[PDB]
């Protein structure tokens, strides 16, 4: 409420992953930065790229790890400190295997739903009590390993809705920032 907020979109750096299921977080962070009219820059003290701005009269810090998914948490801890943000005010956006495609849910705490990015964060923060904006991608077909599923692009049908879904996730995040969780 004077407390700065750290919104983190998870994903993998590199053109080959920009469209994969596991990068929705990056996509949403990109939208939020655009809405804020703020751009990303390499942050010397973390390794992630950051952009800053205002939302709901709140001071905002948007970031996207430049490290691969498993090393996400190690870039977040340092950012939290640099801006002195508490875990509770850290908002992580991520794809979620346990939510049907396009289904968006908010939560603080809870499990990782088999998400490796989420685990490195818990591991790095020493706590599961940070905020999450869960964007459902549904379960993987039996013919596809879960880890491979999230690293592959959305199906033609799903692809047509992803942009819309991300707008909604961006909106949810803003709303969560406005009077979120409780």
Q: How would you describe this structure to a colleague?
A:
- The chain has a single domain, classed as Peptidyl-tRNA hydrolase (Rossmann fold, 3-Layer(aba) Sandwich).
- It is built from 6 helices and 7 strands, in the order E-H-E-E-E-H-E-E-H-E-H-H-H.
- The chain has helices at 24-36, 72-82, 116-125, 146-149, 156-159, 162-179, and strands at 5-9, 41-42, 49-55, 58-64, 90-96, 104-108, 131-136.
- The chain has a 7-stranded mixed beta sheet, sandwiched between helices.
- A hairpin with a 6-residue loop joins strand 2 and strand 3 (49-55).
- The protein is globular.
- The two termini are 13 Å apart.
Q: Which structural traits does this protein have?
A:
hydrolase; Pth; 6 helices; alpha/beta; 182 residues; seven-stranded mixed beta sheet; Rossmann fold; globular
Q: Work out the helix count.
A: 6
Q: Going by CATH, what is the homologous superfamily?
A: Peptidyl-tRNA hydrolase
The neighbouring-strand order within the major sheet is 2-3-4-1-5-7-6
The SSE order reads EHEEEHEEHEHHH
CATH topology type:
Rossmann fold
Helix content: 25-40%
The count of β-strands is: 7
Radius of gyration: 15 Å
CATH level-two architecture: 3-Layer(aba) Sandwich
What can be said about the biggest beta sheet?
A: 7 strands, mixed
> How many structural domains does the protein architecture include?
1
**Approximate shape:** globular
How many angstroms separate the termini?
13 Å
Beta-strand percent range: 15-25%
Structural class: alpha/beta
CATH class, named Alpha Beta
